[PDB]
């Protein structure tokens, strides 16, 4: 394949994320023949490590993905390390040293990617110094991969955006959102625009409601410290959920370039309604998990690091409204929570029932296009057909498809996809500033109500699919959640 | 359930059809509780049999469908017999005797069905005498079930129609076509009108071509005597194929009453183009099977009762054109033959490929809605999705559904459906005069060319899917048969 000539610098190169996903993902790009000779990886972090020590860290990292050691070793030859304080402007001369050293050693003509796998407070600082201290390539490209989260509210996000724009242009900024990197999520556009029957139907004249579900069986487990002030609202809704909604609600772009895609997604984002207190109470539901049927499923308030008086939401379900002609009156439902019935990430498009009367007891029902993203890719299409009865009558049947073992095993993991995409300069699978800002403005209105405690906090048994208020939310529009568990 | 009060008279009540399908089908209606007390079955034929002998014939007939003998015996109590010459006007007084005897014995208020399971030459004669000799009920209804074939050309069909109309009205005439009685064939309307996404797409703006296939693995076997002058053209195309096309090409009716259904089907039939010699050669292909790979698959010319110089068609494939706005330029392909790769009866709706360019190597392809009627009901929907590759690319995937064992075993056989429908006065699943006449006019134009031998007779290996001319036919419009075997 075509050789990818790039030089990547990993800030926080000794962190768990780098060990678990980053390095192994880069290894795959090498094993697939993309990364060959003209590439180098420069790790950097607080602790001290010599090249031998770092390479051993990398060796362990890719161990469970190594088939031939001689290949692993060939790969490891492209790694280097430098201890570095990101707040120390002077210390950047050391990093610049390593980067240029690698550039000459492997003959890489610019093309630099700086991956910030560090705490958010360092994002702005690192960006400033990459530019002021001359770490940016004068030839080729310069791309910055910003790890989650991009802000904690609109103000903090806008602030971050301003800092980053002092050193980079928005098209050089690659915000990490692994859900956008999921194979099935990238199928949405193909299913829609690739099939006229769905393409022409992706609107208010055919769709009754859209449903996005990100449910997990696990509780807070250990992240309670941070999760207690984030909740389902910021941990899963603001980021992952809103970006999936973006692919679903986008207008039909004028081409498939990331530029036209983003413009189409923004057409929808810019039409999203922001709620006030009364609206939040009407269109949104927040809840916290109680005990399940088994004692080991203890209520949220009894988890480690959780304040006994916490009103944090471990579940969020709400309705979105897009003020666009094509979505006029079409409710987009989203739900995400912990300690639910199953672990899934899916999209359910509920089509309006036909109005042609067959004169049967059971008249036509709503067809449903379900796209299962996690755990295993699957696509289901519920259609109206004839029941096997003596008198003519209709019934719904389910057409299905599921990724094969061959395809399941060939599917690239999100981090490999994201890194690979950045190297190619493809932002299709990344959120842009406009989407992030709107997502924040949308969520901020909701958060404001909760912090003020001007909305109820429902409860629900661990193992169920959420509070009854979640069902009642859809019932008000004559809708119901497709997935029951 | 609601009791079906009816009196049925079976002409040719000792024939193989009556034994194999007719009586067992009637038994099911009894076992299902439809037929209870007020019903009677009067068999009649040439040979002599007393009530004991006939009842024993019925007993053997329903033997393989009997669970409780006491139930079978209860059913058999409603049968009677009379030897009768259908050409003998006087002898009709004997049949009238038995019918009225049964009517009083079981207290049946009219509601008579006369099933003509006899050679076609007797159809007109029997009809005349049912009326002239006073066998028609003066109360309730009077329905005539005409066994296949309804004519052998338009003239002979029109002639038959005129004879039957001397005694009955067209809505009292129930022409037998068992394919129309197949469960899956009745699903077509539900799939279309029951799902807006398909309903709005059932036209030239979305469909590239429609395909109807009735393939069999068996050769002529034993029916060569009659088949040699009928061929695939009259044996499967004129009847079964054309009636399936009727459900596919019909306009959207104003309701689901058989009246509006027939009107919608006729709107299409009346728009069907009739071919001249040049057109037949262009849009149609006729073929005769040769040897397969195994010797036991001998060519048609070596079958028993087949003339060594025969130019009979054991395979027909052709293109139909409907001069209706919704089908403007949409080719309807039909094919039927013996000694083919598989035994199937299916419909393949090939949708036009989308024109949205993703910039991939493989752009969008044609989606396909396949409805498998025989042997086992199944529905497949081929859609465009994303391939599991590194670079964005499209591919087709197959969504599927197949009747369950529960549904397979609950499905009524065509003859039970047809008889049951006649008892209820439902003509939805029956061809009307208009459809039959057009089907004949269409086929007659083709037959004329063949009898004159002004078209080629292709050959094909037994076990293949037909002559290469069949593929070349679709290739000319940039189409190909979905089913390959
Ligand atoms: Ca509402
Ligand atoms: Ca043509």
Curated annotation (Swiss-Prot), chains A, B:
Query: A GO CC term?
Result: cytosol
Q: Which residues form the signal peptide?
A: none
| Keyword set, alphabetical order | Carbohydrate metabolism, Glucose metabolism, NAD, NADP, Oxidoreductase
Recorded GO molecular functions are: glucose-6-phosphate dehydrogenase activity; NADP binding
Q: Which domain of life is it from?
A: Bacteria
Q: Which reaction does it catalyse?
A: D-glucose 6-phosphate + NAD(+) = 6-phospho-D-glucono-1,5-lactone + NADH + H(+); D-glucose 6-phosphate + NADP(+) = 6-phospho-D-glucono-1,5-lactone + NADPH + H(+)
Q: What class of enzyme is it?
A: oxidoreductase
What PROSITE patterns has UniProt attached to this entry?
A: G6P_DEHYDROGENASE
Active-site residues, as the UniProt record annotates them = 240 (proton acceptor)
GO BP terms: glucose metabolic process; pentose-phosphate shunt, oxidative branch
- Impact reported for residue 149 to G/V: Strongly decreases catalytic efficiency toward glucose 6-phosphate
- Please give the pathway this protein is involved in: Carbohydrate degradation; pentose phosphate pathway; D-ribulose 5-phosphate from D-glucose 6-phosphate (oxidative stage): step 1/3
Report the outcome of residue 178 to N: Strongly decreases catalytic efficiency toward glucose 6-phosphate
Residues recorded as binding substrate, renumbered to this chain, are: 178, 182, 216, 235, 338, 343
Annotated InterPro entries: G6P_DH, G6P_DH_AS, G6P_DH_C, G6P_DH_NAD-bd, NAD(P)-bd_dom_sf
The disulfide bridges present are none
**One Pfam family named in its UniProt record:** G6PD_C
Changing residue 343 to Q/R has the effect of: Strongly decreases catalytic efficiency toward glucose 6-phosphate
The outcome of changing residue 415 to F is: Decreases catalytic efficiency toward glucose 6-phosphate
Which amino acids does the record list as binding NADP(+)? 12-19, 46, 85-86, 148
Look up what happens after changing residue 240 to N: Strongly decreases catalytic efficiency toward glucose 6-phosphate
**Enzyme Commission number, as recorded:** 1.1.1.363
Question: Which NCBIfam families does UniProt cross-reference here?
Answer: zwf
Q: Which family does it belong to?
A: Belongs to the glucose-6-phosphate dehydrogenase family.
* Task performed by this protein: Catalyzes the oxidation of glucose 6-phosphate to 6-phosphogluconolactone. Can utilize either NADP(+) or NAD(+).
- Output this protein's name: Glucose-6-phosphate 1-dehydrogenase
* Organism, scientific name: Leuconostoc mesenteroides
Report the gene name: zwf
């Amino acid at each position: 394949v075509s050789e990818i000539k790039t030089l990547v610098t990993f800030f926080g190169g000794t962190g768990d994320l780098a060990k678990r996903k980053l390095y192994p993902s880069v290894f795959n790009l090498y094993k697939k023949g993309y990364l060959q000779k003209h590439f180098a990886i420069v790790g950097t972090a607080r602790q001290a490590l010599n090249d031998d020590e770092f390479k051993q860290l990398v060796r362990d990292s890719i161990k469970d993905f190594t088939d031939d050691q001689a290949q692993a070793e060939a790969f490891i030859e492209h790694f280097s390390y430098r201890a570095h304080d990101v707040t120390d402007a002077a210390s950047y001369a050391v990093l610049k040293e390593a980067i240029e050293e690698a550039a000459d050693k492997f003959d890489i003509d610019g093309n630099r990617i700086f991956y910030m796998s560090v705490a958010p407070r360092f994002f702005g600082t690192i960006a400033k110094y990459l530019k002021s201290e001359g770490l940016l390539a004068d030839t080729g490209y310069n791309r910055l991969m910003i790890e989650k989260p991009f802000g904690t509210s609109y103000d903090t996000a806008a602030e971050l955006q301003n800092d980053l724009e002092n050193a980079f242009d928005d098209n050089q900024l690659f915000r990490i959102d692994h859900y956008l990197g999921k194979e099935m999520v990238q199928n949405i556009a193909a299913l829609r625009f690739g099939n006229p029957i769905f393409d022409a139907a992706w609107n208010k004249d055919y769709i009754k409601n859209v449903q996005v579900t990100l449910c997990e069986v696990l509780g807070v487990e250990e992240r309670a410290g941070y999760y207690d002030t984030a909740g389902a609202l910021l941990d899963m809704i603001q980021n992952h959920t809103m970006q999936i909604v973006g692919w679903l609600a986008m207008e039909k772009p004028e081409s498939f370039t990331d530029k036209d895609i983003r413009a189409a997604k923004n057409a929808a984002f810019n039409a999203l309604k922001i709620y006030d207190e009364a609206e939040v109470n009407k269109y949104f539901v927040r809840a916290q998990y109680g005990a399940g049927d088994s004692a080991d499923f203890k209520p949220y308030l009894e988890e480690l690091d959780v304040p006994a008086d916490s009103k944090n939401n471990t579940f969020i379900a709400g309705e979105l409204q897009f003020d666009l002609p094509r979505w006029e009156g079409v409710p987009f439902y989203v739900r995400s929570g912990k300690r639910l019935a199953a672990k899934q990430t899916r999209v359910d498009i509920v089509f309006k029932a036909g109005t042609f009367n067959f004169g049967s007891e059971q008249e036509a029902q709503e067809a449903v296009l379900s796209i299962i993203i996690d755990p295993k890719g699957a696509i289901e299409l519920k259609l109206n057909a004839k029941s096997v009865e003596d008198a003519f009558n209709t019934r719904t049947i389910d057409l299905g498809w599921t990724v094969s073992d061959e395809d399941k095993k060939n599917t690239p993991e999100p981090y490999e996809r994201m890194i690979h995409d950045t190297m190619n300069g493809d932002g299709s699978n990344f959120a842009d500033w406009n989407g992030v800002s709107i997502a924040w403005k949308f969520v901020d209105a909701i958060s404001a109500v909760y912090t003020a405690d001007k909305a109820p906090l429902e409860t629900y048994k661990s193992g169920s699919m959420g509070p009854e208020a979640s069902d009642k939310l859809l019932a008000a529009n004559g809708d119901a959640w497709v997935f029951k568990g």
